[PDB]
């Protein structure tokens, strides 16, 4: 069940996600569309018939959704209108079994709703200090803030630092952009003796920054 | 039509038994309730269908039973591959309903690790860019249950903090949290005390990490 790629729509716009399959695994079977809000549960949205658009939509998405099937390319399409911040989620296409539950799911399609003006990442230093170090363990890091869209890859010391590294998942802000935090716990006895540089890469904007984190 | 799952987080060690319950508001027709397992970064995978019938490829350790409004999923012996998030779903034919439960996360049990809290004041470069963001870090803690409350000058902040939690590490079986309080550069200069109150089980008393100016 191959689906479409990530979609960056704007608030109040519409998105059309595709789910191509093999007719042997779909022409005689039903398909369903589900969404998962970042960090939340699953929400059923509709069911497409084995042939025609005998769709049964959900109440929360009634009038704002439209599901279609194309027997020529054996694909199923989902269209959502009046997009909002609450609609940013990963959408999945799953085939219904003869008994009901979905056996074969899809990879998913992230549908982010924001400004979309593809901004580059801004890496800022999270300098270590006594408030960030206690007991020979020091915490330092980098803040990859105000970047769109995803993703951004962070490296520490050009790959030399791999123990204690924690690249926390990104979170969209009211700005419509993202912010990621990468931190590493390093021994305090060498914070001033060693160099800690974070290498951030944002291929969508073609931006690569190598920021050195220096103690306060 | 509304499915409730208990517990919300199952802290169990590998090799033990696990029992997840799904209480419905009404009776499920033909006992049409299914249980799913969703692994981090992956799509959900069907485990049991029909409340008690296993699907193709599902191990015998996963066992299901239920009727009407009470359903349960049991694991005879917990293995590292079984630690994930489980969901229950009710399905009907006329009309098609298909409703899911909240979700239960089964994690690896470990010693009560207190969260090492570190506060990072924003860099002067950010203040030179017209923005301000303070970061609070909770490293290696168990259980995941942790309350991070931003308090600027003894004033609680809600809606101005965005948090992110890591997945349980495959070797330490701990969690980590990052809290970012973003205020305007002008709003920052007004205040002085910025505190990050952390409530956890490992901390006998609440721990607050703060920075003035």
């Amino acid at each position: 069940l191959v689906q479409s790629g990530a979609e960056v729509k704007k608030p109040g716009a519409s998105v059309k996600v595709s789910c191509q399959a093999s007719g042997n695994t779909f022409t005689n079977y039903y398909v369903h569309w589900v969404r998962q809000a970042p960090g939340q549960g699953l929400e059923w949205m509709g069911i497409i018939s084995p042939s025609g658009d005998g769709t049964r939509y959900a109440q929360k998405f009634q009038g704002r959704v439209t599901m279609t099937r194309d027997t020529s390319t054996t694909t199923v399409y989902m269209e959502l209108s009046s997009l909002r911040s609450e609609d940013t989620a990963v959408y999945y296409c799953a085939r219904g079994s003869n008994w009901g539950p979905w056996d074969y799911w899809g990879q998913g399609t992230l549908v982010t709703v924001s400004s979309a003006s593809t901004k580059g990442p801004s890496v800022f230093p999270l300098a270590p200090s006594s408030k960030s170090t206690s007991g020979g363990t020091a915490a330092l890091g980098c803040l990859v803030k105000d970047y769109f869209p995803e993703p951004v890859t962070v490296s520490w010391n050009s790959g030399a630092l791999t123990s204690g590294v924690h690249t926390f998942p990104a979170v969209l802000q009211s700005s419509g952009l993202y912010s990621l935090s990468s931190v590493v716990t390093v021994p305090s006895s060498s914070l001033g003796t060693q160099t800690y540089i974070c290498n951030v890469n944002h291929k969508p904007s073609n931006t690569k920054v190598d920021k050195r984190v220096e103690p306060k | 039509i509304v499915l409730t799952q208990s517990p919300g987080t199952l802290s169990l060690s590998p090799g033990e038994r696990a029992t997840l319950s799904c209480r419905a508001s009404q009776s499920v027709r033909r006992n049409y309730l299914a249980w799913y397992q969703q692994k981090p970064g992956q799509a959900p995978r069907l485990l049991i269908f029909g409340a008690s019938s296993r699907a193709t490829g599902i191990p015998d350790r996963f066992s299901g039973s239920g009727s009407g409004t009470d359903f349960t999923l049991t694991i005879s012996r917990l293995e590292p591959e079984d630690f994930a998030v489980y969901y229950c779903q009710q399905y009907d034919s006329s009309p098609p309903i298909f409703t899911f439960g909240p979700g239960t996360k089964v994690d690896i049990k470990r010693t009560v690790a207190a969260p090492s809290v570190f506060i990072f004041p924003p860099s002067d470069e950010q203040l030179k860019s017209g923005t301000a963001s303070v970061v609070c870090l909770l490293n290696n803690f168990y259980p995941r249950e942790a309350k991070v409350q931003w308090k600027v000058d003894n004033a609680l902040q809600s809606g101005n903090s965005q948090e992110s939690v890591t997945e349980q590490d495959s070797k330490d079986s701990t969690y980590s949290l990052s809290s970012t309080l973003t205020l305007s550069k002008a709003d920052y200069e007004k205040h002085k005390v910025y505190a990050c109150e952390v409530t956890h089980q490992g901390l006998s008393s609440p721990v607050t990490k703060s920075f003035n100016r």
């Binding site: 039903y30 219904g96 003869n98 008994w99 009901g100 | 049409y32 034919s93 006329s94 009309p95 098609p96």
Partner: peptide, 15 residues
Amino acid sequence: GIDFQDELDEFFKNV
């Protein structure tokens, strides 16, 4: 005999 799929097929026959 009848499975959930067949019952569902009926829903689109009467509607």
